[PDB]
Design a protein around this ligand. Structure first.
Ligand SMILES: [Zn+2]
Length: 195
């Protein structure tokens, strides 16, 4: 996106993103907002319309009262790892909650970018009526769903392949080009969705 579109999307995000009370790196929180601002504005305005909040967290997910119910619960695909949601830095779906500082791949999660993956889940569910379960996307997923790797997770769960593809499409020009090369039908699907 051009600098002016980024600023417009950041203004929209000022009424979506909620910053935490506790201590955190303000510059890194701002960088996360900047990355979210690359998401197409139509989706951001629709999240705002639904009063979805992107809660940035100063600590563990399960230390927020609304996620205490996840204390000790093992995420799907994480069985046998000894890890629980207490160790997971982001969640997305009907809500979005994200630990500041944990954006990059490998910061306790496997996504190319935490905030884009989790926000993609919310866009899928809230804005797009679970499009990752649509017949069109199921056909694409059957063909391309392993082509971002993590074959036994992304290749098995279309909601996760959708969220990861969305993150690749919107993070930066490199990941956007990688998605087009590896998953051309997914790329065209996302490009058309934003038209
Ligand atoms: Zn996910």
């Amino acid at each position: 996106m051009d600098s002016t579109t980024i600023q417009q999307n950041k203004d929209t995000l000022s009424q979506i993103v909620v910053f935490p009370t506790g201590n955190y790196d303000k510059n890194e929180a701002n960088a996360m907002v900047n990355r979210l601002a690359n998401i197409d504005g139509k989706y951001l305005n629709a999240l705002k319309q639904n009063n979805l909040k992107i809660k940035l967290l100063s600590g563990k997910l399960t230390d927020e009262k609304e996620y205490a119910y996840l204390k000790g619960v093992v995420p799907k695909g994480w069985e046998g790892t000894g890890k629980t949601w207490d160790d997971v830095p982001g969640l997305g779906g009907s809500t979005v909650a994200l630990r500041i500082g944990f954006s990059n791949k490998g910061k306790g999660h496997d996504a190319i970018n935490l905030e884009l993956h989790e926000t993609a889940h919310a866009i899928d569910h809230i804005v797009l009526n679970d499009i990752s379960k649509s017949a069109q996307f199921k056909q694409i997923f059957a063909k391309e769903g392993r082509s971002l790797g993590n074959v036994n997770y992304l290749g098995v769960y279309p909601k996760e392949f959708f969220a990861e593809s969305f993150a690749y499409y919107y993070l930066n020009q490199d990941t956007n080009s990688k998605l087009k090369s590896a998953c051309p039908q997914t790329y065209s699907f996302l490009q058309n969705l934003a038209k």
